[PDB]
């Protein structure tokens, strides 16, 4: 019935994940899985409560483009379990191993990313932290959006969010901006502001609105509709940003227009 | 929250086939989906409840090797919504389009099929109707076992003796599933359906019933691993208490899988 994996069917193996928000591993549980150790041992009822409530959200999701939640566990220590992805992150591909994708594939990856997000917003879930780092290309064709449940990745933050004008800057639109940047990534092979060695400047500039991503780097064969759709997603006034309903349409229209 | 998908949201496309109390259509709903249209038009509370229950069973499963449940609808008529698959059924591949899968793939398809079953069993769910038509082969490498909702409540080749002879009220067990598995194991190692050399269905049913007939294993292609052929037989045991369980089945596959690729 309940999604709490009982004690010790999970074989934490191979380390993977970075900082402290959580630490990620490869595991075994009816086949390969990934496990995110929340590493906040001895909760603390109720942070156990807030957490289990966080779970409530993940279990709200059943969809191909969203990293599949398989379960959570408390007992060894708080943790989350998802399907393992045989492949590499949109980030990794693009910016570390430098994968030359077909333009077609690029458009497709965007489309699937688009698909997923739209589904999330359908179930009223703001991701709050999309980035090329969280888009895993499973088996090199299926796009899996993860790390939405529950610092140094500010290139995807809409100014509205950078500059902290109130308590809640995070909208669907904040999410559309992020997506707009991963569009940019796909379309230019690279990061924004790739030519600025200082972070706080980037924060300050995009915040105050002096520094905008260079769109002249969208190489030649990125179709105008897609480039214009990038333009759209990045508009700094969020109201002028199109949501995924419409975002999906614009792509799927130029999707027909070019499998030849 | 509720996995009920309001009427008018699901675009219904191509009719693709029949399957256990409904018709199946390719469909749009947040991108491609499959839709089984439960043609038992307007229940009948509480068969409306029966639906709700079997759905309860479904949402208990979240696995890679299990066809992704996505939603249901009572509203226009009754329906189950799951992920679409670019690919064909394992039955289709094998006995209709005649794909020639290399051994390694075949062991892999097998392993994954097991994978899912173990999961389903891990959650006390008997499939009751595993066949090569149920196992879908998505983007031609990921197995997705579908079709076990309702099935409480067409094809006897996968049916274990203990089932075929009605005998008692419930013959369906894990081991029953294991048998079925055994058959698609045969299917994969031969690309035949069993008893291809008998034209009479009753006859087949009868004899398997008393175990006069049983799959002709000697037909496994020249290079199907020793361990595999051995395992097939363990899964095809006539005495239901001699078949192994999916934990142990995975056990022996993964072994022979590592004893292989190089
Ligand atoms: C629906 C996810 C729930 S969430 O809290 O939003 N995210 C979340 C929770 C637990 C996890 F282990 C992960 N996974 C990761 O952080 N990474 C990951 C990498 C990978 N392949 C690595 C080889 O390229 N396969 C699976 N997961 C999550 F994304
Ligand atoms: C997942 C458990 C729910 S169930 O009721 O047990 N089965 C069940 C429920 C609704 C469906 F649409 C289906 N699907 C099917 O029967 N077939 C199917 C074929 C396909 N393409 C291959 C055509 O090329 N892609 C997706 N699904 C089910 F299997």
Q: Name the residue facing B62 among A31, A64, A69 (closest C-beta).
A: A69
- Long-range CB pairs of A196-200 (<8 Å, 24+ gap) are A199/A152, A199/A154
Q: What secondary structure letter does DSSP report for A66?
A: B
- DSSP secondary structure string for all residues of B39-91: -S-S--TTHHHHHHHHHHHHTT---TTB--EEEEE-SSS-EEEEE--SEEEHH
Contact between residue B30 and residue B79 where contact means Cβ atoms under 8 Å apart:
no
Q: Does ligand 2 come within 6 angstroms of the Cβ of B13? A: no
Q: Does ligand 1 come within 6 angstroms of the Cβ of A119? A: no
Q: At what angle do helices B103-122 and B246-258 cross, to 10 degrees?
A: 150
**H-helix or E-strand containing A233?**
helix A224-234
B21 labelled binding-site residue: yes
A87 labelled binding-site residue: no
Residues of A with CB under 8 A from a CB of B: 1, 3, 30-31, 60, 62-65, 68-71, 83, 115, 118-119, 122, 139, 141-142
Q: How far is A169 from chain B (nearest CA, A)?
A: 25
Q: Find the catalytic residue in A108, A118, A129, A147.
A: A129
State how far the Cα of A48 lies from the Cα of A195, in Å rounded to an integer.
44
Residue range(s) of every CATH 3.30.200.20 domain in chain A: 1-86
Which residue(s) pair with A73 in the sheet? A79
Report chain A residues whose CB lies below 8 A from the CB of B59: 62
**H-helix or E-strand containing A118?**
helix A103-122
Sheet of A142-145, strands arranged across: A87-89, A135-138, A142-145
Neighbours of A132 (CB within 10 A): 24
Q: In the CATH hierarchy, which fold is given to the domain comprising B1-86?
A: Phosphorylase Kinase; domain 1 (3.30.200)
State how far the Cα of B110 lies from the Cα of B116, in Å rounded to an integer.
10
- DSSP secondary structure string for all residues of A3-44: SB--TT-----SB---SSS-EEEEEESSSEEEEEE----S--
Nearest CA in chain B to A111: B31
Residues sharing a CB contact under 8 Å with residue B80, sequence separation 6 or more, in sequence order: B22, B35, B36, B38, B55, B58, B69, B71, B72, B149
Cβ–Cβ below 8 Å for B69 and A83: no
Ligand 1 centroid, distance to A34 Cα (angstroms): 6
State how far the Cα of B108 lies from the Cα of B98, in Å rounded to an integer.
18
For an interface test with A, the pick among B1, B5, B30, B59 (most A C-beta atoms closer than 10 Å) comes out as B30
Report chain B residues whose CB lies below 8 A from the CB of A108: none
Sheet of B32-37, strands arranged across: B11-18, B23-28, B32-37, B79-83, B69-73
Q: In the CATH hierarchy, which fold is given to the domain comprising B87-262?
A: Transferase(Phosphotransferase); domain 1 (1.10.510)
CA B148 to chain centre: 8
Contact between residue B28 and residue B13 where contact means Cβ atoms under 8 Å apart:
yes
**H-helix or E-strand containing B112?**
helix B103-122
Report chain A residues whose CB lies below 8 A from the CB of B63: 30-31, 70, 83
Cβ–Cβ below 8 Å for B3 and A64: no
Q: Name the residue facing A83 among B64, B69, B118 (closest C-beta).
A: B64
Q: How far is A178 from chain B (nearest CA, A)?
A: 20
Phi/psi at B67 (5° precision): -40, 120
Residue range(s) of every CATH 1.10.510.10 domain in chain B: 87-262
Contact between residue B186 and residue B193 where contact means Cβ atoms under 8 Å apart:
no
State how far the Cα of A54 lies from the Cα of A46, in Å rounded to an integer.
13
Residue of A254, A244, A203, A195 lying closest to A224 (CA atoms)? A254
Cβ–Cβ below 8 Å for A64 and B64: no
Question: To test ligand 1's pocket by mutation, which of A36, A79, A92, A127 has the most ligand atoms within 8 angstroms of CB?
Answer: A36
State how far the Cα of B161 lies from the Cα of B172, in Å rounded to an integer.
11
Ligand 1 centroid, distance to A245 Cα (angstroms): 26
State how far the Cα of A85 lies from the Cα of A28, in Å rounded to an integer.
13
- Joined together, the tokens standing for residue B84 give 């679409």
Contact between residue B235 and residue B251 where contact means Cβ atoms under 8 Å apart:
no
- Joined together, the tokens standing for residue B182 give 């055994």
Query: Parallel, antiparallel, or unpaired for β A23-28 and A87-89?
Result: unpaired
One of 1.20.58.190, 1.20.140.10, 1.20.1260.10, 1.10.510.10 is the CATH number of A87-260, namely 1.10.510.10
Name the E strands within chain B.
Answer: 11-18, 23-28, 32-37, 69-73, 79-83, 87-89, 135-138, 142-145
State how far the Cα of B74 lies from the Cα of B38, in Å rounded to an integer.
10
- Joined together, the tokens standing for residue A145 give 């959006």
Q: Does ligand 2 come within 6 angstroms of the Cβ of B90? A: no
Residue labelled with tokens 């491609």: B32
Ligand 2 centroid, distance to B78 Cα (angstroms): 15
**H-helix or E-strand containing A176?**
helix A172-188
Q: Name the residue facing B64 among A63, A68, A141 (closest C-beta).
A: A68
State how far the Cα of A115 lies from the Cα of A245, in Å rounded to an integer.
9
Q: At what angle do helices B174-190 and B226-235 cross, to 10 degrees?
A: 140
Task: Tell me the C-alpha to C-alpha distance, in Å, between residue A257 and each of A100, A107, A135, A226, B230.
Answer: 22, 11, 25, 12, 53
B19 labelled binding-site residue: yes
Ligand 2 centroid, distance to B34 Cα (angstroms): 6
Residue of B57, B60, B79 lying closest to B4 (CA atoms)? B79
Ligand 1 centroid, distance to A160 Cα (angstroms): 27
Q: Resolution for this model in angstroms, one decimal place?
A: 3.5
Q: At what angle do helices A244-256 and A172-188 cross, to 10 degrees?
A: 30
Longest Cα–Cα distance in chain A: 58
Contact between residue A166 and residue A159 where contact means Cβ atoms under 8 Å apart:
no
Q: Name the residue facing B30 among A30, A60, A122 (closest C-beta).
A: A122
């Amino acid at each position: 019935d309940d999604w709490e994996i009982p004690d010790g069917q999970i074989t934490v193996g191979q380390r993977i994940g970075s900082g402290s928000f959580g630490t990620v591993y490869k595991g075994k549980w009816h086949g390969d899985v990934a496990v995110k150790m929340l590493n906040v041992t001895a909760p603390t009822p109720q942070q156990l409560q807030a957490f289990k409530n966080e779970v409530g959200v993940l279990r709200k999701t059943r969809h191909v483009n969203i990293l599949l939640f398989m379960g959570y566990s408390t007992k060894p220590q708080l943790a989350i379990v998802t399907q393992w992805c045989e492949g590499s992150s949109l980030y990794h591909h693009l910016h570390i191993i430098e994968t030359k994708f077909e333009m077609i594939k690029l458009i497709d990856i965007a489309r699937q990313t688009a698909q997923g997000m739209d589904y999330l917003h359908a179930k009223s879930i703001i991701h709050r932290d999309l980035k090329s780092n969280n888009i895993f290309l499973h088996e090199d064709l299926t796009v899996k959006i993860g790390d939405f449940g529950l610092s140094g990745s500010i290139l995807w933050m809409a100014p509205e969010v950078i500059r902290m004008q109130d308590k809640n800057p995070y909208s669907f639109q904040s999410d559309v901006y992020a997506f707009g940047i991963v569009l940019y990534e796909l379309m230019t092979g690279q990061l924004p502001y790739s030519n600025i060695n200082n972070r706080d400047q980037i924060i300050f500039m995009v915040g105050r609105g002096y520094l905008s991503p260079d769109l002249s780097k969208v190489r030649s064969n990125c179709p105008k509709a897609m480039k214009r759709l990038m333009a759209e997603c990045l508009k700094k006034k969020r109201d002028e940003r199109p949501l995924f309903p419409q975002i999906l349409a614009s792509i799927e229209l130029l999707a027909r227009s070019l499998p030849k």
